[PDB]
RNA sequence: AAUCGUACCGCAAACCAACACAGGUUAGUUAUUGUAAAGGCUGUAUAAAACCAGGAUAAAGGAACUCGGCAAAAUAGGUUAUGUUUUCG
């Protein structure tokens with residue numbers, strides 16, 4: 166069968182799996198945020214907007 | 216306040232003329248009123264939403280009053296019952312348009328056929344007069 | 355307003371099987387005089403159809419249908435042609451035109467034909483005996499004569515009862531259901547007002 | 556001249572199936588009668604010239620049978636009325652050659668050849684066509700030859716009503 | 729267009745247009761617009777639009793080839809055509 | 823009675839497939855006896871090579887084809903007196 170369609174977008178799934186509230190809920194996620202602050206990435210999470 | 220709006224720009228409705236908001240191409244039921252080129256802020260706002268295709272006999276409809284009497288007492292069945300009632304209301308708007316479009320097509324076809332008959336009659340009458348002249352000229 | 359053929363023997367009929375024109379010259383002349391003279395033929399005859407081609411055809415069918423309803427037994431096409439012309443005057447010219455009208459009636463079950471019985475297919479094909487036609491007082495939904503219609507209805511009635519109970523036994527609705535579609539809009543309301551005005555006038 | 560092919564009738568295929576091929580040629584023939592001059596590609600023009608000549612022949616016939624055939628070709632009532640009344644009288648004496656074709660070079664985009672198709676006797680004609688009936692000198696070998704071979708040669712246009720029809724009407728009235 | 733532009737240039741300099749000969753012509757590469765087009769199975773190819781410069785030089789009394797083209801008149805349409813006046817009675821004689 | 827959604831695409835040239843991709847994509851509704859209302863859409867210029875692909879017709883023979891009736895063709899449908907086998911349906 167044709168492959169290459171492994172991404173099926175879903176807004177609710179994206180926020181629950183990779184959101185800021187999720188990253189701040191565990192020690193390992195908090196360490197991930199610090200690593201991205203140290204490298205100086207402009208956007209920290211897929212969930213961020215102004 | 217009236218129940219239904221009566222002053223519509225029918226050139227806009229059929230599609231020959233552009234609306235007051237050209238960016239909207241297919242108005243929703245509640246967007247027809249403000250897309251009308253003849254919109255005026257002095258006219259009172261109707262108490263109900265109807266499209267231009269609705270018949271004047273819809274002013275005596277009271278749909279939510281009947282729905283309350285048929286309301287199931289079980290909330291789980293009530294939610295599904297309400298969902299189908301909203302589906303019924305929305306579909307009724309597009310039954311009117313379909314009847315509107317079919318009804319006008321029949322009237323147009325009748326008028327076009329009538330014009331076709333008249334044109335042929337004039338052409339045949341003109342030729343007959345020409346034919347008569349030929350015989351008269353030859354004596 | 356029937357028109358005569360150039361031979362002045364019959365009227366031309368409005369259908370694609372008519373190969374004779376209508377004489378329309380202001381003076382009456384024999385065919386032989388002007389046909390071989392070399393003059394343009396359009397000066398003497400009209401080869402085209404009338405502006406009311408479709409309406410005339412519908413009127414002729416009604417005359418044929420009404421006459422059959424007045425008959426009490428099946429008759430031939432020749433009798434139909436003579437009967438209509440005698441009642442109203444010279445309005446039909448050939449039996450082929452009447453046959454074409456009858457075929458339309460047969461298709462929509464406004465009339466029926468009585469066919470003979472033959473021992474072999476080849477005898478039926480080669481037979482030349484004329485056919486007999488009747489008319490239904492009202493449009494039916496089955497083909498054939500009233501005896502055949504009754505037989506067909508009986509078979510249909512049995513099938514309907516068979517299907518309805520089979521559906522009930524297999525947990526289906528005995529009678530199919532649909533939703534009522536609203537077919538009354540602003541256009542229909544204006545048509546009704548127009549109809550009343552015409553009726554009043 | 557128009558080339559003859561191996562298919563039924565010897566017509567062009569116009570790069571189309573037979574069903575679409577007939578729908579196209581009927582439409583163009585209707586427009587030729589309406590406007591009397593059209594510019595198109597060489598292949599469509601060659602086919603239209605031969606098809607157009609045969610459509611005029613039906614109009615000259617002026618019979619019920621001819622009208623039935625033409626009623627399946629022409630698309631508009633006004634164009635069909637003109638064919639039997641106006642064009643029929645125009646080409647009474649002309650024996651063939653009612654349409655002419657002149658080439659006009661190549662197009663711009665696809666560089667296809669083009670041509671102009673027109674009727675051969677009217678106001679606005681590109682050229683002046685020869686008379687429908689050729690005059691014959693009174694003291695020429697041509698006159699003697701035609702007498703020996705075809706005593707019924709036509710030298711001048713004939714009236715709409717010949718003397719025999721006129722005489723009959725006079726006697727009747 | 730280049731030929732016409734060059735001749736206009738020659739006249740401004742004071743040369744006789746009736747003695748001009750095409751003595752030099754060549755092309756030169758311009759700036760290209762690069763692009764890509766997809767292919768089957770995830771491969772890719774090039775999609776380039778090319779451009780070129782043209783240079784023409786005209787000189788007087790330069791060595792020239794002897795080629796010459798025959799010229800004929802086009803189709804005569806209008807009142808200038810008189811094919812309809814032909815007398816066809818002569819061809820019946822001997 | 824506040825607050826958020828309301829444009830446009832949505833079997834698709836605008837979403838998932840690097841593409842204007844012959845692929846993938848949920849629910850609700852509509853005309854039509856042998857047909858089919860509304861609505862929607864639209865192809866550089868020709869032709870009388872070999873060869874290739876998808877169709878049509880074919881004298882006499884009728885599996886002689888081939889690893890193999892592969893492919894193609896074929897009255898294909900319904901009701902039967904009687905007989906056979908059954909775990910008796």
Ligand SMILES: [K+]
Nearest residue numbers: 608609610612
């Ligand atoms: K012909």
Ligand SMILES: [Mg+2]
Nearest residue numbers: 240241242243
């Ligand atoms: Mg919208």
Ligand SMILES: [Mg+2]
Nearest residue numbers: 169769770839
């Ligand atoms: Mg890919």
Ligand SMILES: [Mg+2]
Nearest residue numbers: 880881882883
């Ligand atoms: Mg064979």
Ligand SMILES: [Mg+2]
Nearest residue numbers: 885886887888
């Ligand atoms: Mg073998």
